[PDB]
Structures are given as C-alpha cells and as structure tokens.
Write an enzyme that holds these catalytic residues in place. Structure first.
Site, PDB file in Angstrom:
ATOM      1  N   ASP A 272     -31.274  -7.669 -65.242  1.00  0.00           N
ATOM      2  CA  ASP A 272     -31.976  -6.434 -64.914  1.00  0.00           C
ATOM      3  C   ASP A 272     -32.532  -5.767 -66.169  1.00  0.00           C
ATOM      4  OD1 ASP A 272     -32.981  -4.268 -63.480  1.00  0.00           O
ATOM      5  OD2 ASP A 272     -31.087  -3.167 -63.584  1.00  0.00           O
TER       6      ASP A 272
ATOM      7  N   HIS B 126     -38.745  -8.459 -54.242  1.00  0.00           N
ATOM      8  CA  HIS B 126     -38.544  -7.168 -54.892  1.00  0.00           C
ATOM      9  C   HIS B 126     -39.616  -6.863 -55.935  1.00  0.00           C
ATOM     10  CE1 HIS B 126     -36.439  -3.585 -56.053  1.00  0.00           C
ATOM     11  NE2 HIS B 126     -36.376  -3.983 -57.311  1.00  0.00           N
TER      12      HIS B 126
HETATM   13  C1  HEM Z   1     -34.500   1.419 -55.599  1.00  0.00           C
HETATM   14  C2  HEM Z   1     -35.642   1.495 -56.278  1.00  0.00           C
HETATM   15  C3  HEM Z   1     -36.023   0.476 -57.376  1.00  0.00           C
HETATM   16  C4  HEM Z   1     -37.139   0.574 -58.097  1.00  0.00           C
HETATM   17  C5  HEM Z   1     -38.196   1.693 -57.967  1.00  0.00           C
HETATM   18  C6  HEM Z   1     -37.180  -0.533 -59.026  1.00  0.00           C
HETATM   19  C7  HEM Z   1     -38.178  -0.766 -59.944  1.00  0.00           C
HETATM   20  C8  HEM Z   1     -38.370  -1.932 -60.649  1.00  0.00           C
HETATM   21  C9  HEM Z   1     -39.482  -2.214 -61.531  1.00  0.00           C
HETATM   22  C10 HEM Z   1     -40.646  -1.246 -61.838  1.00  0.00           C
HETATM   23  C11 HEM Z   1     -39.317  -3.448 -62.019  1.00  0.00           C
HETATM   24  C12 HEM Z   1     -40.260  -4.177 -63.000  1.00  0.00           C
HETATM   25  C13 HEM Z   1     -41.481  -4.674 -62.228  1.00  0.00           C
HETATM   26  C14 HEM Z   1     -42.340  -5.530 -63.118  1.00  0.00           C
HETATM   27  O1  HEM Z   1     -41.991  -6.721 -63.319  1.00  0.00           O
HETATM   28  O2  HEM Z   1     -43.373  -5.018 -63.619  1.00  0.00           O
HETATM   29  C15 HEM Z   1     -38.092  -3.991 -61.465  1.00  0.00           C
HETATM   30  C16 HEM Z   1     -37.566  -5.238 -61.720  1.00  0.00           C
HETATM   31  C17 HEM Z   1     -36.320  -5.691 -61.339  1.00  0.00           C
HETATM   32  N1  HEM Z   1     -35.357  -4.956 -60.654  1.00  0.00           N
HETATM   33 FE1  HEM Z   1     -35.747  -3.183 -59.651  1.00  0.00          FE
HETATM   34  N2  HEM Z   1     -36.046  -1.299 -58.824  1.00  0.00           N
HETATM   35  C18 HEM Z   1     -35.302  -0.715 -57.812  1.00  0.00           C
HETATM   36  C19 HEM Z   1     -34.096  -1.198 -57.334  1.00  0.00           C
HETATM   37  C20 HEM Z   1     -33.435  -2.323 -57.786  1.00  0.00           C
HETATM   38  C21 HEM Z   1     -32.130  -2.789 -57.352  1.00  0.00           C
HETATM   39  C22 HEM Z   1     -31.263  -2.067 -56.295  1.00  0.00           C
HETATM   40  C23 HEM Z   1     -31.851  -3.917 -58.034  1.00  0.00           C
HETATM   41  C24 HEM Z   1     -30.611  -4.844 -57.979  1.00  0.00           C
HETATM   42  C25 HEM Z   1     -29.599  -4.716 -57.116  1.00  0.00           C
HETATM   43  C26 HEM Z   1     -32.974  -4.193 -58.908  1.00  0.00           C
HETATM   44  C27 HEM Z   1     -33.071  -5.265 -59.770  1.00  0.00           C
HETATM   45  C28 HEM Z   1     -34.206  -5.703 -60.419  1.00  0.00           C
HETATM   46  C29 HEM Z   1     -34.393  -7.025 -60.973  1.00  0.00           C
HETATM   47  C30 HEM Z   1     -33.392  -8.201 -60.957  1.00  0.00           C
HETATM   48  C31 HEM Z   1     -35.798  -7.017 -61.587  1.00  0.00           C
HETATM   49  C32 HEM Z   1     -36.504  -8.184 -62.306  1.00  0.00           C
HETATM   50  C33 HEM Z   1     -36.154  -8.191 -63.790  1.00  0.00           C
HETATM   51  C34 HEM Z   1     -36.694  -6.950 -64.451  1.00  0.00           C
HETATM   52  O3  HEM Z   1     -37.905  -6.923 -64.791  1.00  0.00           O
HETATM   53  O4  HEM Z   1     -35.911  -5.984 -64.642  1.00  0.00           O
HETATM   54  N3  HEM Z   1     -33.918  -3.206 -58.733  1.00  0.00           N
HETATM   55  N4  HEM Z   1     -37.542  -3.037 -60.633  1.00  0.00           N
END
Ligand code: HEM
Ligand code: HEM
Lengths: 298, 296
Positions: free
Chosen positions: A142, A211
């Site tokens: 993450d 996601h």
């Molecule tokens: C609830 C609202 C959430 C929002 C608004 C959010 C937002 C984001 C954003 C903006 C990205 C990067 C997108 C890109 O590649 O440009 C991302 C990536 C990611 N998020 Fe979320 N997220 C949320 C919840 C979660 C949750 C609950 C999890 C895990 C249980 C999670 C895990 C990850 C993972 C594994 C990635 C891909 C690796 C990374 O670029 O961090 N996210 N998310």
C-alpha cells in the site's frame, strides 16, 4: 506551514483518534492547540522518535469557530447500500500522529487530553502499524503510487488564500474479511486490486471495477491525486484491516473516488469492497500551524 | 532447553493470547506444536526481529494429555474480598510471544491459528508494548528487581525430572483506574508502590500493605523470585494497564504472592489493587521443547 504529520512519509506507527466535544469547548480547543508544543517537547526528550501531529476539525464543529470555514468543507455523506456501505460518523475532531515508536503515541494522547477527559468522548481510537514491507493485511503493498517528495506538498496543501498550508482530510476505518479474501488465488486477487501482489507493478489491462481502476481517475485531463497516510491495524480475534486516511488540497478528489468506489458514478462498485467494509467515515480540514493557534470560539 | 520466550529479556513488543479448545483437539494440538517451527522461519526471513514463542497448557486442558499434569499445576483459584478480587478464567492454552517489532506478532498469531479458528475460541488477545523507559502506565518503572542474565535460568526453569526445562506460568490482565490513581500526590503513590517514582529506588521502609511489601516474600529462603515478562497494554478510551505474566520453576511462588496480595495470607490486601483490577487470571505450565512435541 502545514502541520508536521501531513507532508512527511508515514512512520512505522500511527495514531488516529476521532472524538466528540461534549462540554467546556474553550478548554478543549486550548488543549488541542497545546498538542504541537507537547510533541516538540517529546521530540527533544526522545531523539529518533520523529513524533508528528495534525489536528483537524469537522464541518459541524467548525461552525463554533470565528474563522470562516473552508470553501469545500462538508459533512461526510453516506454512500452505497448493504454490503457496499460508507457510514457517516458523528465526530468533531481528528487527532493524527505518526512516529518511529508506538509508546509515545499513547503518551501523547493520554497526556494531551488529561485535563479535558470529562469534556470529551472518544468515538474511535485506532493505533496503526506498518505491516511487513509496507503491506496491507491483504498481502498487497500500500502506497506504491502515493506522491513522493515535492509533489506531496502541492497535492496535499492548499496553495493560496487564508487556508493556505491547510489540507482537507478524510478517514475511513475498514474491517477486513481475510478468510473470504484468502479463497481467491494470486491472479484473481491481482484482478481485484489492479496491481501485481509481490512487486506492485500495475497490470497491463486494469479492470474498470478493480480498485485502482476505480481510484485512478483523470478528468482534467490530469490524475486526481491524494496523499495517503493509511496504516494497517487491529487484532486477530477482533477488528483488523486498514485505517484509511488521506490529505488533499481539494475535497473534490475524495468525493470523486468515493462516488466511483461505491457505485454512484458508474453504477459499479469496487471489487475490493467485497472483502472489506468501512465502519467509520468523516471529512475534516487540517489548518496550517498558524491558523490552528489563531482559532477561537464564537 | 526451554521455550524461546522465557529466558531472554522481553522485547519492545509482546503478544499474550489465552484460548479455549472447542473440538478437534488432536489437530489443535498439532497446530500449536507447529508454532516453534513457524517462529524460527519468521526469524530467518526477518533478521533482527528476535521473535520468540512459548506455548503453555492449563490444568483443565492437561486432562486431555495422556501425560500427567505437573505436580504443582492447579486450577487458578478465586482470591480476595471486596474491590480486591482475583477472577479465574477457564482457558486451555497460553501463547506468549515477544519481539523487536509489533507487526510480526499479529502475523505470527494470524498465521499460526487461523486454520484452527473453527476449532478454537480466543478468550483474550493482548498486545503489550514497552512504555517510555520501561515504565508501567502508573508512571512507575516495572522490572527493576526482575532477575537478570544467569539468574533467569535458575528462577524460571524446572531443574530436574521429566518436567525439567519447563516452567510454571501465571497470567493476569489488569485494568487501571488512572484518574483515581491521579488524585493521590507523589508521596502517597510511592508509599502504595513501595519505591520512588522517578528512579525506582526502594523505600527504606516498605510498608507491609504496599505492593512491594506484598510480593517481596521471605520463606528462608528468604527470597521468592519469579521471572516477569509483563508489559503495558491497551488504549486511552478503553481498557489499559498491565498484562502481568510470570514464569517460575515452582507454582508455589505465584500462589504465595497472590495470597499475600489479596489478603488471604495475613488479611491485609495490596494497596495497588485499589487503583487496578484483575479481569483475567490463569495458571499454566509451559513444557520443554521436547515434552511439547511429544505431548499426546
Ligand atoms: C476508501 C477509500 C480509498 C481511496 C479513496 C483510495 C485511494 C487510492 C489511490 C488514489 C490510489 C493510487 C491510485 C493510482 O495508482 O494512481 C490507491 C492505491 C491503492 N490502494 Fe487505495 N484507497 C482507498 C481504500 C483502500 C483500501 C481499503 C485498501 C486496502 C484494504 C487500499 C489499498 C490500496 C492498494 C493495494 C493500492 C495500489 C498500490 C498503491 O498505489 O498504493 N485502498 N488507493
Ligand atoms: C497492575 C498490576 C501490577 C503492577 C502495576 C505492578 C508494579 C510493580 C512495580 C512498580 C514494582 C517495582 C519495580 C520492580 O521491582 O519491578 C513491582 C515489583 C514486583 N512485583 Fe509487581 N505489579 C503488579 C502485579 C504483580 C503481581 C500480580 C505479582 C505476583 C503475583 C507481582 C510480582 C512482583 C514481584 C515479584 C516484584 C519484585 C519485588 C522485589 O523483589 O523487589 N506484581 N511491581
């Protein structure tokens, strides 16, 4: 100048506290203002701690202030239905800390609210921790595409006006269903997330319902970016998952991603939300250090 | 050889799990036996972790073993009167871990137990952490007179016989009443504990009712020693205090201290118990690595 918790990379441990102000509002505000001074003192007593703090207030509590509210600051709206639901939490204040050690987080909260314990009800208190090599309990890394260095400042912080140096905040405590998630194989899990699991390389064909497919939004056309400070939390026999928290120069990015995730935009929900559920949800605005010390009740 | 968690000093982070066995006892036991191999594997994959583990079984669960119980192993008895009461928790197994990092504690438990989660009910799951300069949340240092180095092996471990290398274990999760403790001034707190607060210097006069006075027991002897792996735990808005856990070659030391604390021995109770309350109480015996793998 932003509050010290926002711009730097998240430490190995973090504290996320949501509280409601019941009485003695002036005493509570003072105690919140005195948090940075306490943190500075702790850092002087404890080299390497790198203790940081950011105090933020909700739309509802901001009415109590003499200072005008941020233009985009609103109540966290409820989204979705049933198994894909984003609850709204009744909360006035967010206290966000992260450091290289866990104990000072507990100390900062205990010492920080010691005089206003009866004036306050803590709605939620979550201690986050870095899990393995910056991984979520889902096994995926993450923060891979999380902004880095200089662009963190221009993504998180308001550029101009009275609220310059301030930042919009969102938080959602997620509870994971690990056994259900465990059923899916590596390839299938990568289709849900949208990235490879061991090395977090983006898939050549990112599913729209994945996601990343939901949150990688560009409409300007330029990507809607946020600065995430999320961290895994919890116990095996109790709630465990991710305390999601993000900072952004505009609340619009939060609203767009959430409406995309919970089926408001397309009608499709996030595949990730099949294996996790939000139990809290709130919007805040974390003012600059100066404004924080200049806030007064009406 | 003892189990890896007992002899070394407690790491900055610790896990304490009490659980009861529902069914599939044969393949709950096998899963528990697999824990040392898992911890070793984690230590290989994670250098510097210093992850350790100790599995212990209660008197009630020792019925299932064809192997008979340790001679001193008993059910944890309810002790005390009034505010000062020591509850007894029906539990089968204790899983004790400590390491230099917190995330591996969750990882170890989730990995080691989730497969048998259908057959197992977690009675308690406590994550301890060293607080400031080894202080309890009362503000007093914990572990000043705790046995060190060479003393630890002779205090904690059974010296002779079949149960040699093993250790009697006691566990009590305490819940602190900090505001009540806060009303007292510095001198009063020191008299309750039995030592100075900032530097943990033992008072020239340790009152018989003070905590030190209750647990500093003499049987000629005259020093009844235990190896404490206790560590602070909890949240501000919820339960917080100290997860007390101790190892010793004889259960007699535990029973004697607890009788002294809860006004059974002399009739005077521990003054510290006015500001904290035990919510959990249990006796175990952590077998040696050998007996552990051959328990049937
Ligand atoms: C609830 C609202 C959430 C929002 C608004 C959010 C937002 C984001 C954003 C903006 C990205 C990067 C997108 C890109 O590649 O440009 C991302 C990536 C990611 N998020 Fe979320 N997220 C949320 C919840 C979660 C949750 C609950 C999890 C895990 C249980 C999670 C895990 C990850 C993972 C594994 C990635 C891909 C690796 C990374 O670029 O961090 N996210 N998310
Ligand atoms: C909330 C619960 C407890 C708290 C806050 C507490 C705190 C303390 C403190 C501050 C000391 C002095 C520092 C030190 O020498 O380690 C101490 C000593 C000690 N305590 Fe505890 N204690 C608790 C429960 C217990 C229990 C239940 C037992 C035994 C059944 C126990 C056994 C001992 C022993 C053996 C010593 C060493 C005394 C000496 O030889 O000088 N403690 N405790």
């Amino acid at each position: 100048k932003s509050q010290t918790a926002i711009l730097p990379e998240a430490g190995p441990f973090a504290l996320y506290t949501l509280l409601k102000v019941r009485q003695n509002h002036a005493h509570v505000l003072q105690a919140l203002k005195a948090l940075p001074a306490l943190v500075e003192e702790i850092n002087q007593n404890q080299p390497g701690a790198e203790l940081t703090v950011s105090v933020a207030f909700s739309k509802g509590f901001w009415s109590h202030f003499e200072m005008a509210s941020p233009p985009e600051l609103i109540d966290f709206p409820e989204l979705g239905e049933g198994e894909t639901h984003a609850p709204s939490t009744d909360v006035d204040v967010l206290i966000h800390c992260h450091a290289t050690r866990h104990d000072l987080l507990f100390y900062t909260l205990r010492k920080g609210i010691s005089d206003i314990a009866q004036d306050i009800e803590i709605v939620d208190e979550t201690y986050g921790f870095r899990y393995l090599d910056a991984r979520d309990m889902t096994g995926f890394i993450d923060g891979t595409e999380n902004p880095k260095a200089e662009k963190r400042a221009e993504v998180a912080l308001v550029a101009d006006g009275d609220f310059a140096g301030g930042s919009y905040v969102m938080v959602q405590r997620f509870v994971h269903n690990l056994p259900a998630w465990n059923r899916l194989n590596l390839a299938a899990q990568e289709k849900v997330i949208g990235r490879t699991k061991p090395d977090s390389v983006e898939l050549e064909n990112v599913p729209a319902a994945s996601h990343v497919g939901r949150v990688d939004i560009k409409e300007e056309g330029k990507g809607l970016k946020i600065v995430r400070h999320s961290l895994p939390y919890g116990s095996v026999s109790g709630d465990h998952g991710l305390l999601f928290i993000a900072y952004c120069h505009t609340l619009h990015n939060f609203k767009t991603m959430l409406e995309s995730m919970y089926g408001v935009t397309d009608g499709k929900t996030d595949q990730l939300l099949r294996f996790t559920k939000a139990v809290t949800g709130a919007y805040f605005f974390a003012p600059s250090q100066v404004m924080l010390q200049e806030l007064t009740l009406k």
